[PDB]
Amino acid sequence: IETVPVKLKPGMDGPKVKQWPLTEEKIKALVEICTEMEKEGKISKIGPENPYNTPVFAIKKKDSTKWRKLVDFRELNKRTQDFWIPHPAGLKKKKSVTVLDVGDAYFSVPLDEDFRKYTAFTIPSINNETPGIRYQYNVLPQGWKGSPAIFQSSMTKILEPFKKQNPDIVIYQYMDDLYVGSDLEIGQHRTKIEELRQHLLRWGFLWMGYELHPDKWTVQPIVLPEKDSWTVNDIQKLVGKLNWASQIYPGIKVRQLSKLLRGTKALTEVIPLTEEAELELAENREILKEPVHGVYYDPSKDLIAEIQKQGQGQWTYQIYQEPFKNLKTGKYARMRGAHTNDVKQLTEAVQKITTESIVIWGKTPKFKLPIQKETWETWWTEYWQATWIPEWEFVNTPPLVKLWYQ
């Protein structure tokens, strides 16, 4: 019934980000939603004295025919104060982790008055024939960094009985998402999840669930080919890949293998491996089987995620903080209605990687997408199904390290 004082960072005014073009369907959906939200006192009309603005659009969650209002609070979140929980390292060690959407709960807590002006947003009209409908939030808005921090005190006391009753289940909270992990059987797991959402509904669309399996999350080691006959091209690619691996693993040697390439031979000509070469290759395998030396996580640094398009619906990715120091590596080959759409695939990939990163470290990585800025920015909203939005930059120069990760 009482609000907590919220302010921005010293020397920073509220966000003034432009509203990007919305389609007809999304505009109708947003109008329909914001009408009812206005009726429920969640949002209110504002005048021209509010110059601030935050982009907004609409999506559809995993298998749902009901639109969801999503706000891009990325600029507000980096301008708002740092609201000052040690991340559950056991969350990535559980057998099954269900993601829940507890965003609606935030709408039960009033927002600080003197801060409301900063959550201003605009529903645009087609061709701007009519003035855009401007709103601001009266309660805790979904997607805002302050919402889970403020509601934390409430959420704790809300979940106390369930947590006391089940001391094995690991619960984590990130933005509008609640990650609930356990080692129970999938059926009993679903029963516990349903029990939890019924425990939340009784406490005052939380019916959807998003199940993950951190135990089945496979990692990518560096592998070298095993052939009976090596061509010049094969050996050249091998030496190249090993030379790249030398930046990660110190003891990598290619001298003896390079001795096979001496003399200008044809690329298709088969070269029989000498003993020194085979020994060198063996040692290299043994080195590549070991973990990377001096790899640690720094909570104060940024997570960086790189993605490579491998073709045939396959993508590879790496999450790190320092170059040649991968905290995570992975590979996807998903068929989610994107057989003939690269951008849809890449979007889903970004969402999956981000989800994994949230589970493991507790925050989202900065992406480096193999795509032109315009192309991505034109289409990524049409395939987005997450309540959060990570940061991203664009790489325009084809990385030579593509096939080496495949």
Partner 1 sequence: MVPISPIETVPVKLKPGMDGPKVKQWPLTEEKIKALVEICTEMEKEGKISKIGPENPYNTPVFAIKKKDSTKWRKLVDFRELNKRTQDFWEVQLGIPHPAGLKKKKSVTVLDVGDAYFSVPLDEDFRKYTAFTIPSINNETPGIRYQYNVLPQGWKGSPAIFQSSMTKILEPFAAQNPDIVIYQYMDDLYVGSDLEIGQHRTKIEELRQHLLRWGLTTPDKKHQKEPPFLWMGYELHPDKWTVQPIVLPEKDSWTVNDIQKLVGKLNWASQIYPGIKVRQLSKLLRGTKALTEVIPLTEEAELELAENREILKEPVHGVYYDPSKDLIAEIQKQGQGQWTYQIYQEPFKNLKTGKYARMRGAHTNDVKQLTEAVQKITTESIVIWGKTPKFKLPIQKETWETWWTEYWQATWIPEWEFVNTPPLVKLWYQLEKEPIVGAETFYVDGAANRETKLGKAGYVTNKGRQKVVPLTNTTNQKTELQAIYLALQDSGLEVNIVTDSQYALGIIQAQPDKSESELVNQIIEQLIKKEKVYLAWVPAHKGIGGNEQVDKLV
Annotated binding site for Mg(2+): 101, 176-177
- For partner 1, which is the closer residue by CB, 64 or 233? 233
Between CA 148 and CA 249 the distance in angstroms is 41
Please identify, using beta-carbon distances, which residue of 9 and 213 lies nearer to partner 1.
9
- Residue 126 token pair: 């087609």
CB of 400 to partner 1, least distance (A): 6
CB of 310 to partner 1, least distance (A): 10
Minimum distance from CB of 277 to partner 1 (Å)?
Answer: 12
Q: How far apart are CA 188 and CA 182, in angstroms?
A: 10
User: Residue 112 and residue 2: Cα distance in Å, rounded?
Assistant: 9
For partner 1, the closer of residues 255 and 289 by Cβ is 255
Helix axes 146-165, 186-201, angle to 10 degrees: 120
Q: Which residues contact partner 1 (rule: CB under 8 A)?
A: 21-24, 27, 47-51, 53, 126-132, 134, 231-233, 236-237, 239-240, 243, 254-255, 258-259, 261-269, 309, 311, 341-346, 369-372, 374-376, 378-379, 397-398, 400, 402
Residue 119 near residue 109, CB atoms below 8 Å: no
Provide the minimum distance between the beta carbon of 405 and partner 1 in the complex, in angstroms, as a whole number: 13
What is the distance between the alpha carbons of residues 288 and 273, in angstroms, rounded to a whole number? 20
Q: Which residues are annotated as a binding site?
A: 101, 176-177
Looking at the Cβ atoms of 62 and 259, the one nearer to partner 1 is 259
CA dihedral 194→195→200→202, nearest 10 degrees, is 120
Nearest to partner 1 of 259, 334 (CB atom): 259
User: Amino acid identity, residue 268?
Assistant: T
Tokens of 335: 């068929």
Among 99, 78, 117, which Cα is nearest to 358's? 99
From residue 28, give the alpha-carbon distance in Å to each of 25, 65, 215, 313: 5, 15, 42, 34
Please count the other Cβ atoms lying within 10 Å of the Cβ belonging to residue 110. Answer: 16
Which residue in the block uniquely carries the two structure tokens 């398009």? 309
Nearest distance in Å: CB 80, partner 1: 18
Give 206 or 224: the residue with its C-beta nearer to partner 1. 224
Min dist CB 35 to partner 1, Å, is: 12
